[PDB]
Enzyme design. Structure first.
Site, mmCIF file in Angstrom:
data_model
loop_
_atom_site.group_PDB
_atom_site.id
_atom_site.type_symbol
_atom_site.label_atom_id
_atom_site.label_comp_id
_atom_site.label_asym_id
_atom_site.label_seq_id
_atom_site.Cartn_x
_atom_site.Cartn_y
_atom_site.Cartn_z
ATOM 1 N N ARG A 137 -1.535 65.270 -16.838
ATOM 2 C CA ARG A 137 -0.962 64.895 -18.127
ATOM 3 C C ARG A 137 -1.336 63.482 -18.548
ATOM 4 N NH1 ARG A 137 3.574 62.883 -20.868
ATOM 5 N NH2 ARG A 137 4.750 62.220 -19.015
ATOM 6 N N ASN A 154 19.944 66.959 -18.092
ATOM 7 C CA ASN A 154 19.982 67.841 -19.255
ATOM 8 C C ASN A 154 21.369 67.729 -19.878
ATOM 9 O OD1 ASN A 154 17.398 68.888 -19.213
ATOM 10 N ND2 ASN A 154 17.950 70.755 -18.092
ATOM 11 N N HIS A 211 9.735 70.572 -21.893
ATOM 12 C CA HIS A 211 10.296 69.426 -22.611
ATOM 13 C C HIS A 211 9.222 68.712 -23.427
ATOM 14 C CE1 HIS A 211 14.210 69.428 -20.402
ATOM 15 N NE2 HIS A 211 13.470 70.044 -19.497
ATOM 16 N N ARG A 267 14.562 59.396 -23.195
ATOM 17 C CA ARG A 267 13.838 60.386 -23.980
ATOM 18 C C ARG A 267 14.675 61.656 -23.968
ATOM 19 N NH1 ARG A 267 10.213 64.639 -23.366
ATOM 20 N NH2 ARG A 267 8.639 64.898 -25.008
ATOM 21 N N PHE A 272 10.985 78.037 -10.690
ATOM 22 C CA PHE A 272 10.905 77.409 -12.002
ATOM 23 C C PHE A 272 9.827 78.073 -12.866
ATOM 24 C CE2 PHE A 272 10.235 73.664 -14.914
ATOM 25 C CZ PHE A 272 11.533 73.620 -15.399
HETATM 26 C C1 HDD Z 1 9.886 71.814 -9.654
HETATM 27 C C2 HDD Z 1 9.851 72.022 -10.897
HETATM 28 C C3 HDD Z 1 11.002 71.670 -11.748
HETATM 29 C C4 HDD Z 1 12.356 71.956 -11.655
HETATM 30 C C5 HDD Z 1 13.065 72.871 -10.585
HETATM 31 C C6 HDD Z 1 12.982 71.326 -12.836
HETATM 32 N N1 HDD Z 1 12.015 70.637 -13.545
HETATM 33 FE FE1 HDD Z 1 12.303 69.226 -14.922
HETATM 34 N N2 HDD Z 1 10.255 68.855 -15.300
HETATM 35 C C7 HDD Z 1 9.351 69.430 -14.393
HETATM 36 C C8 HDD Z 1 9.522 70.272 -13.303
HETATM 37 C C9 HDD Z 1 10.772 70.830 -12.957
HETATM 38 C C10 HDD Z 1 7.991 68.940 -14.697
HETATM 39 C C11 HDD Z 1 7.010 70.177 -14.839
HETATM 40 O O1 HDD Z 1 7.363 68.068 -13.619
HETATM 41 C C12 HDD Z 1 8.146 68.018 -15.900
HETATM 42 C C13 HDD Z 1 7.411 68.226 -17.285
HETATM 43 C C14 HDD Z 1 6.217 67.267 -17.275
HETATM 44 C C15 HDD Z 1 6.813 66.049 -16.680
HETATM 45 O O2 HDD Z 1 6.520 64.904 -16.775
HETATM 46 O O3 HDD Z 1 7.789 66.475 -15.962
HETATM 47 C C16 HDD Z 1 9.586 68.016 -16.194
HETATM 48 C C17 HDD Z 1 10.374 67.311 -17.140
HETATM 49 C C18 HDD Z 1 11.714 67.300 -17.326
HETATM 50 C C19 HDD Z 1 12.458 66.497 -18.339
HETATM 51 C C20 HDD Z 1 11.730 65.624 -19.384
HETATM 52 C C21 HDD Z 1 11.502 64.173 -19.044
HETATM 53 C C22 HDD Z 1 10.758 63.602 -20.286
HETATM 54 O O4 HDD Z 1 11.482 63.425 -21.256
HETATM 55 O O5 HDD Z 1 9.571 63.408 -20.092
HETATM 56 C C23 HDD Z 1 13.780 66.675 -18.188
HETATM 57 C C24 HDD Z 1 14.948 66.080 -18.990
HETATM 58 C C25 HDD Z 1 13.928 67.591 -17.017
HETATM 59 N N3 HDD Z 1 12.679 67.975 -16.515
HETATM 60 C C26 HDD Z 1 15.174 68.015 -16.616
HETATM 61 C C27 HDD Z 1 15.365 68.922 -15.553
HETATM 62 C C28 HDD Z 1 16.706 69.385 -15.114
HETATM 63 C C29 HDD Z 1 18.081 68.916 -15.637
HETATM 64 C C30 HDD Z 1 16.418 70.320 -14.143
HETATM 65 C C31 HDD Z 1 17.385 71.162 -13.279
HETATM 66 C C32 HDD Z 1 18.285 70.597 -12.312
HETATM 67 C C33 HDD Z 1 14.961 70.456 -13.970
HETATM 68 N N4 HDD Z 1 14.382 69.548 -14.876
HETATM 69 C C34 HDD Z 1 14.357 71.311 -13.024
#
Ligand code: HDD
Ligand code: HDD
Lengths: 698, 698
Positions: free
Chosen positions: A348, A127, A54, A91, A140
Site C-alpha cells: 500500500r 471501530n 476501510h 482517521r 477475516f
Molecule cells: C488480520 C486481519 C484483520 C483483522 C482480524 C481485523 N483487521 Fe482491521 N485492518 C486490517 C486487517 C484486519 C488491514 C487489512 O491490515 C488494514 C487495512 C489496510 C491497513 O492499513 O490496515 C486494516 C485497517 C483497519 C482500520 C483502518 C485504519 C485506517 O484508518 O487506516 C480500522 C479502524 C480497523 N482495521 C479496525 C479493526 C477492528 C475494530 C477489528 C476487529 C477487532 C479489525 N480491524 C480486525
C-alpha cells in the site's frame, strides 16, 4: 514563486508541449520535452492502492490528555501523565466500500487513533461497534470477501445487502451478535462526531509493580450517539457522498472541536476465568453491569489536515503499535491482526512507511533497520549490527523505559482450535436486541427487511429467517412476512429476556442539552417576515448552530419589509436530508408561493418523514399544516406556542413572541426554546412509533 | 476439489490459526503457521492502484464486424474484411470518481474498445462526448486536478459541482464547447447501452495505395440515446451506485446484447485546411452537414466477464495501440495521449501488463523485449538482439504486413504553441446550445443552476455568469437570477443562431419503436385484479421488457380472485428511480390500501415527477389521479383508453380491453399499446415543459 520542474528549472508556460509548429500549420509533439513528460509522468503515477478494508475515510489532528492517572493499571506515561497533552491523528472510515463510496452507507465505522507519545507511537485501531463478526483472524478474508462486491460482477458497492453477506452470516454462527449490531442504528451514524469508539479486542495494561490487567478501551462522544434514518442515509449517499467528511471538516473549521471521553474496563489477571464468556472472545462485550467503564481522559480533534493525500490517505495504523505499559492478550482475533497491519503496508505504501511525516514518531528512533525503497534517512557510521565493538545503539533496560514483556504462563497443545467458552454464539445477540428501545428495535426490523429483500436467493433469506428465531421468535415472524421464507415456531436457543445497560443509544445523550454544530435550514421566498427571520437567525448562531438560508433562487430574496438577503442555496440545489431541522418564517406572500412550490412542499414532507424538527411562524404555520395534512399533527391557532410531534408553531406573532428566554429544555415557554429543544432531541421518534411517517409521501 | 495453499498443500480447516490451546484455556497464535500467514498475506495485498482517471467502470466481451468494406480509406483488415468477426472487450466508465463512486453522476463517460484483430490489438479509447476540455495534452493534469476532489480536504467526490472546476472552465476558454456538452443530458445517460461513443481525436487511415485520410470515429446505439433527469440521477447514485453496471450485466445475461453502429467521417489529405476550424483541434466537432458519418460496421456486447478484477479492472487500453492502416495525426491532444497509456501502466499494473490474459493479442508476438517483474513468458534461445547471426526475428516488409508509417511532410519551428485556427473558442459552443431542443436547453439551464449553486466562491460563479454571455445572452441572465452574479448585457462573441444536425439527442431515436430491456414496475397489494395483472405481465415479457412486481411485502400478495404471487421487492426496498415506468392494476381493496400508503403514493408522484410513463386500470385510475392531484392530467372515466402527459388509464375494464393488438406507435388503440408507446418514448417531456413536475412533491 514561479513554475518549475521537479528538478528546479523555471518554465515559461504550462499550456503547450514543445512541438513543431508554424503560424498556419501545427506539427507533431517532440519526444525531447522533459517538462511536459515530467508533468504527465507525475500525473500518470499519482495513485496508490486503497486500503483493502476501510478504504473510505476522513481524518483530523487533535490532542489527548488524561485527567485521572491510571497508574494503578499501567505505567505508560500517556495514560498516567495528567500534565502533558499527547498529539493524535484520528482517521474515521467505513469498511466495505472502495475510496469513492458514500459516507452514509450502512456499515461498521472505523475509529483509528494514533497517539504520538514521548515513548513512541501507540495506535488504538478500533471501530464504532464493540464486537466483531469472527473470533479468529484467519477468517477475516472470508467475512470481508462475503460482504464486499461479489467477484463475478463486482456488485454491490459498499453494501451488506446481497446474497453472499447473509450467506456467511447464517453459516458462521460466531457472527450472530455482530450482525445484530450491524442492523442497529449504530451502523448509520448522523456524524462521526456522534458515535462511540471501541478497541474491540482485549488488550492488557502493566503497572510499575509488574501486575497485569486485561482491558477494553472505550470512546464516548460528548455530543451523544445519534443516527440517521434509512431513506435519508440512502439519499445522502447520492446527494452528498461526502456528508460525514464535510461534517467533520466543517465543525473543526468552525471551532466546534469534537470531544470524546476515554474509558477503560479492567479485569484483574486473577479473575480472567470468572465469567460465563471468555474475556478474550471478540464476539463478546463485557457487560458494564459486571465490569464498569472507568473514564480517565478526553480527546478532541482541533485541526484539519493541510493536504488530504500525504496525510489522511497515507497514514498507517496497526495493533502492533503499543508502548511500554500496554500489551496484547491471547484474543485470537487480535493475535492475527498484529501480523496484518505491518504486512499490508509493504504494497500500500512501501517498506519505509514509518518515514512518512504522518507516521513518524515524535521521539528519537534508533536501530539498525536499513535501506528499503524510497529511503530518506541517512545514517552516518561504519556499523549497522548488534553487538558491535563500539557498543553503538545498545538495548534499553526496563528502568530506562525498555518495553516490558509480561511473562505470561502458557500451557496446552499446538492445534487449530479455540477453547470451550468460545462455543457460545447466541446469548449476547439476544441481550443486545433485548436492550434496544422500541424505536431501535423497529429500526433493526426495517434493516433486516431491507437487507434480506435485496437477497435474490430464497435459500439465503430463507435460512436467515430461521436464524433470527435464535435471537427472538417474534422478530423472525415479522421478517418472514416482510421478505419471505418460513419463521420457525421453536428454537434451541430460547431468549430469556434479560437486558443490560449502556447498549441502547438512549443511554448516551449529550453531556448537556445542546444544538451545537447542528444545521438549520431557514426556508424563505419573496415576502418573508424579516422579524421571525432575524430572531431565528441570531438565536441559531448564538447557540453554535449553523443557519442555512434556502430560497427559490440563490441571487436575491426580498422580505415583506423590503430588506433583502442572498440565500446560501436555492430549493433545487439542496434537500432537507442535508440539515438537522427546518424553520419557515411567516409572510403571506412567501407562504403562498411556497405552498405552490412542489420542491418546497417536499422539503417539508421529507423533513417530517425523516423525523426532523420543524418550526414555523405566522402564515407558514398553515403552509406546514397543509403540507403534512395530518389530523394527528396539531398546530398553533393563536399567539400561543404549540408543539406536536416535534413540529413547533406560532400562528400569531406578537411583540413578546421572540423575547422569551431561549431555554433548551422539556416544556420551554418560548417558541425558539421549544423549537431548539426539538432539535436537541435530534429526532422525534413518536412520529414514527405512531406510524405518521408512513402516511406521508417523501 | 479441496482447500489447499497456493503451493498445493491440502488443509483441514479454514477456520483456525495454529495456536497453543487447551480445553479451557486459549493461548497465543504461532508464527510458524504458513497456511494462515499465506491467507492473510494474499488478502493484505489484494488491491492495486485505481486508474488515475476513469477509475469507476464496467465492461463486457463482444464482437465487431464491418458489413461494408472501407478499403478505399484503409487496408487494415479489421475494417475491410466483411467475412471475419473481430472479438472485442469494451469498458465503459465515468471520469472523475474513484472506484466506489456512483454510476449515475454527471460526468463524461468513457467508451473504450479493444479490438483483438489477427493483425494485433487496436484500441479505440473514446468518450460519449465528441470533444474535450483542452487542445494540448500537457494540460490534462490541470483540468483533471480542477475537476477532482479539492486537495486540502478531498471534497467533492465524482462531481464537477465545486469551485475549482468552474474556476478552470472560466479561465481556460478552450474548454467552453466542452462544458456546454458537460451540462447537457449527454452527461447523465440512462444506460451505457443508450449513449454514443466517439474517438474524439482526429486519427488517420491509410489505404493500399498509400493514400491517407483524416478521420473521426463514431459509435451510435441502436437503442437510441436516452438520459435520466437530475433528481433521479442523484437518488440512484445513493440508492443503487451500481445502476449502470447492473443494467449492462443484466441485459447481457438476459440475451439483450447491446449494439452500436460504427461510423467514420473522412477528410482527404488535400482538404485538411479547407475549414474554418482546424480539423486536428479536439475542441471541435466536424459538423455532419459538412462531413457526413459513413456507417460501415456493427459491434455487440454478448458476454459478461468471468471475474471482474483480473479482467475488467486489469484491462489496459492506449491510443498507442494502432494496427497497420490506422495512424495518428498531429492533433496536439492525441500526441500526448500516446505517451500516457504506456507510462501509467508501469505503476497501475506492471511492466509486463501486455502478458495479462485480458491484454494479450490473439496473434503471434515476436520481439526481443525481455524480463521485467512477474514475467511469465519463457523464451528459448541464445540470442535476444537484432541484428544477429541467425537472423532471428527479422522485421516484416510492408508486403508482409509491416506497419506503414505515412511520410507526412512537416515544416516549422520548435516552439510551445498552436497554430492560428486553434484560437477560436466560442463558435461551436454556441452551435451546440443552438442545436439543442427546448427540453434539452431547459435541462442544461437546470444543470448550470445546480452546479454554480454549489460553488461557494462568488468570484467563481460570478465569472461563469459573465462567460455564459459568450454562449447566449439569455442563458446568462437566467443563470444569474438563479445563482447570483450579474449577467452582462453585451458580449464580444455574438451568437448568430446557426444550428446543425445530429447534436440534439432527439436525432438519435431507437432503430425501431421498442421497449426492449426496459424495466416496468407492477405495483400491487392484497386484492389486486389478477386479469389486468396477467395481461400486463405477459405483454411486458413478450416485448422483451422486464416486469418487476412490487408489493407491501415480499412474502405473498393475494389477488381479488384468490390467486397469489410473491413480489420481487416490497415498497420500501425499491424506488421508482430504479425502473422505466410503473403499472398499477385494479382491485378496489388494493387501490384503497395503496391510497393510504405514503411510500406507494411517493412511487406514483416520483414516477410522475421524473417524467416516466404511468399506466393504471380499474380502481387504480382514481388512485393515480388523486395521488398526482393535477387538473392538467386527465384520466379515463369509462371503458375508453385515455392518455394524458404519458399517463395511460382505463377505468372500466371490459372483455375486449386486453384483446387489442399491442402496437408500439403514436395513437395506438389498446391500453397496452398506448402504455408501451409512452414507455418507448422514454420520458414525457411535455410534462416538464408545462411545469407539471414543479407542482408535485417528490
Ligand atoms: C488480520 C486481519 C484483520 C483483522 C482480524 C481485523 N483487521 Fe482491521 N485492518 C486490517 C486487517 C484486519 C488491514 C487489512 O491490515 C488494514 C487495512 C489496510 C491497513 O492499513 O490496515 C486494516 C485497517 C483497519 C482500520 C483502518 C485504519 C485506517 O484508518 O487506516 C480500522 C479502524 C480497523 N482495521 C479496525 C479493526 C477492528 C475494530 C477489528 C476487529 C477487532 C479489525 N480491524 C480486525
Ligand atoms: C495525456 C494524458 C491524457 C489525455 C490528454 C487524455 N487521457 Fe485518457 N487516460 C489517460 C491519460 C489521458 C491515462 C492517465 O493514461 C489513463 C487512465 C489510466 C489508464 O490506463 O489510462 C486514461 C484512460 C482513459 C479511458 C479509460 C480506459 C479504461 O476503461 O481503462 C478512456 C475512455 C479515456 N482515457 C478517454 C480519453 C478521451 C476521449 C480523451 C480526449 C480526447 C482523453 N482520454 C485524453
Amino acid at each position: 514563486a514561479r513554475l518549475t520542474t521537479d528538478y528546479g528549472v523555471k518554465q515559461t508556460t504550462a499550456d503547450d508541449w514543445l512541438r513543431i509548429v508554424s503560424d498556419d500549420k501545427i506539427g507533431p509533439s517532440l519526444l525531447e520535452d522533459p517538462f511536459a513528460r515530467e508533468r504527465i509522468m507525475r500525473f500518470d503515477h499519482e495513485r496508490i492502492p486503497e486500503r483493502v478494508v476501510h478504504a473510505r475515510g476522513s481524518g483530523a489532528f487533535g490532542k489527548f490528555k488524561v485527567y485521572e492517572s491510571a497508574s494503578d493499571l499501567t505505567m505508560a506515561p500517556v495514560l498516567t501523565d495528567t500534565s502533558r497533552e499527547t498529539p493524535v491523528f484520528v482517521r474515521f472510515s467505513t469498511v466495505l466500500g472502495s475510496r469513492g463510496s458514500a459516507d452514509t452507507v450502512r456499515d461498521v465505522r472505523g475509529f483509528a487513533v494514533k497517539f504520538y507519545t514521548e515513548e513512541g507511537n501507540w495506535d488504538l485501531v478500533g471501530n464504532n461497534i464493540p464486537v466483531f463478526f469472527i473470533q479468529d483472524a484467519i477468517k477475516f478474508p472470508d467475512v470481508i470477501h462475503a460482504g464486499k462486491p461479489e467477484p463475478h460482477n463486482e456488485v454491490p458497492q459498499a453494501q451488506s445487502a446481497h446474497n453472499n453477506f447473509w450467506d456467511f452470516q447464517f453459516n458462521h454462527t460466531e457472527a450472530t451478535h455482530m450482525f445484530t449490531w450491524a442492523m442497529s442504528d449504530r451502523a448509520i451514524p448522523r456524524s462521526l462526531r456522534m458515535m462511540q469508539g471501541f478497541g474491540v479486542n482485549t488488550y492488557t495494561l502493566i503497572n510499575a509493580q509488574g501486575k497485569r490487567h486485561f482491558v477494553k478501551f472505550h470512546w464516548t462522544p460528548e455530543l451523544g450517539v445519534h443516527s440517521l434514518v434509512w431513506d435519508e442515509a440512502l439519499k445522502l449517499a447520492g446527494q452528498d457522498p461526502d456528508f460525514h467528511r464535510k461534517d467533520l471538516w466543517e465543525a473543526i473549521e468552525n471551532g466546534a472541536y469534537p470531544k470524546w471521553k476515554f474509558g477503560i474496563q479492567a479485569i484483574a489477571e486473577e479473575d480472567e476465568h470468572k465469567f460465563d464468556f471468555d474475556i478474550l472472545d471478540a464476539t463478546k462485550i463485557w457487560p458494564e453491569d459486571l465490569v464498569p467503564v472507568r473514564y480517565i481522559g478526553e480527546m478532541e480533534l482541533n485541526r484539519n489536515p493541510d493536504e488530504f493525500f500525504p496525510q489522511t490517505e497515507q497514514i498507517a495504523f496497526c495493533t502492533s503499535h503499543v508502548v511500554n505499559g500496554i500489551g496484547f492478550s491471547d484474543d485470537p482475533l487480535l493475535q492475527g491482526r498484529n501480523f496484518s497491519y505491518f504486512d499490508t503496508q509493504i504494497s500500500r505504501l512501501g517498506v519505509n512507511f514509518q518515514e512518512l511525516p504522518i507516521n513518524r514518531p515524535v521521539c528519537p528512533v534508533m536501530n539498525f533497520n536499513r535501506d528499503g525503497a524510497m529511503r530518506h534517512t541517512i545514517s552516518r557510521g561504519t556499523v549497522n549490527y548488534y553487538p558491535n565493538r563500539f557498543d553503538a545503539c545498545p538495548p534499553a533496560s526496563l528502568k530506562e523505559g525498555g518495553y516490558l514483556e509480561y511473562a505470561q504462563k502458557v500451557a496446552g497443545i499446538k492445534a487449530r482450535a479455540r477453547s470451550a467458552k468460545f462455543k457460545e454464539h447466541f446469548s449476547q445477540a439476544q441481550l443486545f436486541y433485548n436492550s434496544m428501545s422500541p424505536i431501535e428495535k423497529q429500526h433493526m426490523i426495517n434493516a433486516f427487511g431491507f437487507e434480506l429483500d435485496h437477497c435474490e436467493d430464497p435459500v439465503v433469506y430463507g435460512r436467515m429467517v430461521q436464524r433470527l428465531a435464535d435471537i427472538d421468535l417474534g422478530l423472525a415472524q415479522t421478517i418472514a412476512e416482510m421478505v419471505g421464507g418460513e419463521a420457525p415456531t421453536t428454537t434451541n436457543h430460547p431468549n430469556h429476556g434479560r437486558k443490560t445497560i449502556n447498549l441502547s443509544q438512549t443511554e448516551f445523550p449529550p453531556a448537556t442539552p445542546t444544538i451545537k454544530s447542528r444545521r438549520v435550514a431557514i426556508i424563505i421566498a419573496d415576502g418573508y417576515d424579516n422579524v421571525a427571520y432575524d430572531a431565528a437567525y441570531a438565536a441559531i448562531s448564538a447557540n453554535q448552530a449553523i443557519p442555512l438560508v434556502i430560497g427559490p433562487r440563490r441571487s436575491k430574496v426580498t422580505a415583506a419589509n423590503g430588506s433583502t438577503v442572498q440565500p446560501h442555496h436555492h430549493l433545487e440545489g439542496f434537500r432537507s436530508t442535508m440539515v438537522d431541522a427546518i424553520f419557515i418564517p411567516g409572510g403571506a406572500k412567501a407562504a403562498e408561493t411556497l405552498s405552490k412550490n412542489g420542491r418546497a412542499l417536499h422539503w417539508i414532507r421529507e423533513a417530517f418523514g425523516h423525523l426532523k424538527a420543524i418550526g414555523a411562524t405566522g402564515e407558514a404555520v398553515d403552509l406546514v399544516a397543509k403540507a403534512i395534512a395530518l389530523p394527528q399533527v396539531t398546530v398553533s391557532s393563536e399567539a400561543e406556542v404549540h408543539e406536536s410531534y416535534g413540529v413547533v408553531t406560532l400562528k400569531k406573532v406578537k411583540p413578546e413572541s421572540f423575547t422569551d428566554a431561549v431555554k433548551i429544555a422539556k416544556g420551554a415557554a418560548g417558541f425558539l426554546g421549544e423549537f431548539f429543544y426539538a432539535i436537541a432531541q435530534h429526532r422525534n421518534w413518536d412520529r414514527e412509533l405512531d406510524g405518521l411517517h408512513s402516511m406521508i409521501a417523501y
